Homo-oligomer: 82 residues x 2
């Protein structure tokens, strides 16, 4: 049968929150750290996070949109029951 | 003194990795889950992740750029010592 979403929904929620919050959390570190300001260490840290998150936003946004595209359609084509 | 980056660098690395990899990890779930395809549960899950990550990319990208802007300049203005 379909390994659907019930228990996995929690993992989805828990990780959704963890992923987004941890990213922002780390930015919170950077500001709380910028209270004293580090050299290239700080610069490199957030710069990597920034170039990575943006690079990844592009790949993941397109991925996500397409992944759900095929899933959304695929699911509502196959799931026609209650 | 400055609460600088040495031990915090590891937390930065560990969390940078955890944040980005967990987001992609969760996409991996979605595809491994789309192998069977869930209804609105799947749709809602990734759609939220997508709208959130993009909303947040915008806020965090601008934040990060400005946070390091002030930190980069501020730090290299203050840190002129070895």
């Amino acid at each position: 049968g379909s390994h659907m979403a019930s228990s996995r929904q929690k993992y989805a929620e828990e990780e959704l929150e963890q992923v987004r919050e941890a990213l922002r959390k780390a930015e919170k570190e950077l500001e709380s750290h910028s209270s004293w300001y580090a050299p290239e260490a700080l610069q490199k840290w957030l710069q990597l996070t920034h170039e990575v998150e943006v690079q990844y936003y592009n790949i993941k946004k397109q991925n996500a949109e397409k992944q759900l595209l095929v899933a959304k359609e695929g699911a509502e084509k196959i799931k026609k029951k209650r």
